[PDB]
Amino acid sequence: GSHMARMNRPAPVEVSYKHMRFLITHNPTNATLSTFIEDLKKYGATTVVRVCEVTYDKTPLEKDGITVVDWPFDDGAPPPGKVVEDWLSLVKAKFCEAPGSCVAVHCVAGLGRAPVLVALALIESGMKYEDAIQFIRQKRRGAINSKQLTYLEKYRPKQRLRFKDPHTHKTR
């Protein structure tokens, strides 16, 4: 009312290494749009990856004027890892073009898809499989079973697999 508060909204989380940083926040609410653009943008301005059901795509982006990727889960939601490859390119371009910028992501405090996306984005900084698994491990991420570890494993190159011997034989 005057000086009393209620409800407990998920707390934000910022993941940063070296120079760049990341922001983990909850999707826009219907009671305070402006307050969100200010805080979300307050930390900084860069691409944003929110993987949740779309309710207000224009309100938050148009108010903060920030670039964001809309990843929804419906009857026609692309399940293949290729989707990740899509957000990877988006962040990859925004990462190389904007060194040490400010990114915003969905609240990983629960279970979702944003957490994997974030790690994969920071992967561009070198320690791809190492940073993603290490930085994502520290922070609470969705249910990582097969795709995350298998996908990232393939996401990182290995000379051990590209070991070809000069003298060899072929038949089948």
Q: Residue-wise over 129-165: b if at least 16 C-beta within 10 A, else e?
A: bebbbebbeebebbebeeebeebbeebeeeeeeeeee
Q: Is position 75 annotated as part of the catalytic site?
A: yes
Sign of the Cα torsion 85, 90, 95, 97 reads positive
How far apart, in whole angstroms, are the C-alpha atoms of residue 20 and residue 49?
Answer: 16
Contact indicator for 22, 15 with CB cutoff of 8 Å = yes
What is the token pair recorded at 59? 């309100």
Distances (CA, A) of 159 to 130, 156, 163, 164: 16, 10, 6, 10
The experimental method is NMR
Among the options 52, 64, 74, 75, which is catalytic? Answer: 75
Among the options 39, 52, 70, 107, which is catalytic? Answer: 107
Q: DSSP secondary-structure letter at 10?
A: P
How far apart, in whole angstroms, are the C-alpha atoms of residue 39 and residue 44?
Answer: 9
Amino acid residing at 142: G
The structural domains of the chain, ordered by start, are: 1-172 (3.90.190.10)
The string of DSSP codes covering 76-121 is: T---STHHHHHHHHHHHHHHHHSTT-EEEEE-TTSSSSHHHHHHHH
Sign of the Cα torsion 76, 94, 25, 134 reads positive
160 among annotated binding-site residues: no
